[PDB]
């Protein structure tokens, strides 16, 4: 009911705009892929948290049943937060409620405003890390 | 040398020129008179684009020959 | 269901076809256009037949449809993502504009690049400066991206 | 009010009728006898539902572009 290819065309529009003071980030990981379906996210660690000031870069998929079905995140920065794999850095949908409970009008800046949000979680906020900078392969 | 440039308004103004005075003289002279940065600005004269490191004599603009001023978009 | 004009539209689309142009609605979302429009003969497209997609969002007539090539293409018109600079599609569009007036605006498009009034920048600047050599570019990416798709 | 203007610039009245027809281009049914049309400076004539939501985002008839303000 939502076609896949203009909604994620608006997601590149607002994408490029930058929202809010500018602690997630998403566009195109190839800016001539006509499928629209590979993205790169950043996200600035929130405040009072050990994740603070820390830029985490991610990859989300988009696949033919978006935005009907969730997209894929994985993080390229090593991080330790619940739901995220300790080798891949892939995301489980079970473990975050908007991927757990997706719906057709979310969106790439959601999923990336709530995994940061999660980040500010008691579970996850005094997670000791690892050094900055690091990636899984 | 005296030239007008006109905006989409209908104002008019007139600059001190010289035949060898360079398109961003005159937009650097656009701009101390109306507050208008030079990369803002399109001159256009009998149709043609004006380019900014040409010179007013290039396009034949003889005395009290009328510029055209818009404005210098992104692109369509 | 839809408004009865997007019915009506529908039904003289699929009766009366635009030459050179097929274009159905999707069998589960009668706003959403498969489009596969046929490269002009005479242009560097011809033997190309280029995948499009359009779509009527819910203001429709009120908003224009939304239109993309899904196969890549060499116009001055058309980006990287398939994106489509046409008057019509934006400030030119009316209310009394149909989708069949849209698709032969973008045939023609096709037949008639617009390298004056460019989307694709570097492809518009080739137009300019070396017409021929970017027809044999069109040419190319027809036999590239547009034949058996 | 942009519906004020509307008023000012155009003449809204019921049709009159009764295969050589009118149509409205907007919603592409027959204007019927009865029914609340608008004929705008250029001539053009519509359902008033169906301008009206057009004329509230422009000031331009659908048909040929013609702003409803325009004199002369
Ligand atoms: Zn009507
Ligand atoms: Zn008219």
């Known amino acids: 009911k939502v076609p896949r290819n203009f909604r994620l065309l608006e997601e590149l529009e607002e994408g490029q705009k930058g929202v809010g003071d500018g602690t997630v ?113 | 040398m005296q030239i007008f440039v006109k905006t989409l308004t209908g104002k008019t103004i007139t600059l001190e020129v010289e035949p060898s005075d360079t398109i961003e003289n005159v937009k650097a002279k656009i701009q101390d008179k109306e507050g208008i940065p030079p990369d803002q600005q399109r001159l256009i004269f009998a149709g043609k684009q004006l380019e900014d490191g040409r010179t007013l004599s290039d396009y034949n603009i003889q005395k009290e020959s009328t510029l055209h001023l818009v404005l210098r978009l992104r692109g369509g | 269901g839809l408004p009865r004009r997007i019915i009506k539209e529908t039904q003289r689309l699929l009766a009366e076809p635009v030459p050179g142009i097929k274009a159905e609605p999707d069998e589960s979302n009668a706003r959403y256009f498969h489009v596969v429009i046929a490269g002009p003969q005479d242009s560097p497209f011809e033997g190309g037949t280029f995948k499009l997609e359009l779509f009527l969002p819910e203001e429709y007539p009120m908003a224009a449809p939304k239109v993309r090539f899904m196969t890549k293409i060499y116009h001055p018109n058309v980006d990287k993502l398939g994106r489509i600079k046409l008057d019509i599609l934006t400030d030119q569009w009316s209310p009394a504009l149909q989708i069949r007036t849209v698709l032969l605006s973008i045939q023609a498009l096709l037949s008639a690049p617009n390298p004056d009034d460019p989307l694709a920048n570097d492809v518009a600047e080739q137009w300019k400066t070396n017409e021929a050599q970017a027809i044999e570019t069109a040419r190319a990416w027809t036999r590239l991206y547009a034949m058996n798709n | 009010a942009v519906q004020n203007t509307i008023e000012r610039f155009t003449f809204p009245h019921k049709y009159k009728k009764d295969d050589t027809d009118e149509k409205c281009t907007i919603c592409l049914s027959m204007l019927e006898d009865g029914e609340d049309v608008r004929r705008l400076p250029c001539m053009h004539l519509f359902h008033q539902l169906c301008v009206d939501q057009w004329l509230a985002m422009s000031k331009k008839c659908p048909i040929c572009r013609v702003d409803i303000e325009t004199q002369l």
């Open chain 1, 25 to 137: 980030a998403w566009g195109l990981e190839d800016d001539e892929d006509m499928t629209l379906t590979r993205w790169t996210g950043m996200i600035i660690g929130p405040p009072r948290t050990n994740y603070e000031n820390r830029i985490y870069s991610l990859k989300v998929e988009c696949g033919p049943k978006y935005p009907e079905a969730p997209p894929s995140v994985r993080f390229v920065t090593k991080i330790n937060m619940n739901g995220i794999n300790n080798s891949s850095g892939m995301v489980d949908a079970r473990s975050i409620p908007v991927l757990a409970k997706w719906q057709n009008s979310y969106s790439i800046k959601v999923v990336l405003q709530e995994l940061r949000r999660l980040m500010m979680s008691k579970e996850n906020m005094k997670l000791p890390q690892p050094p900055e900078g690091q990636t899984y392969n």
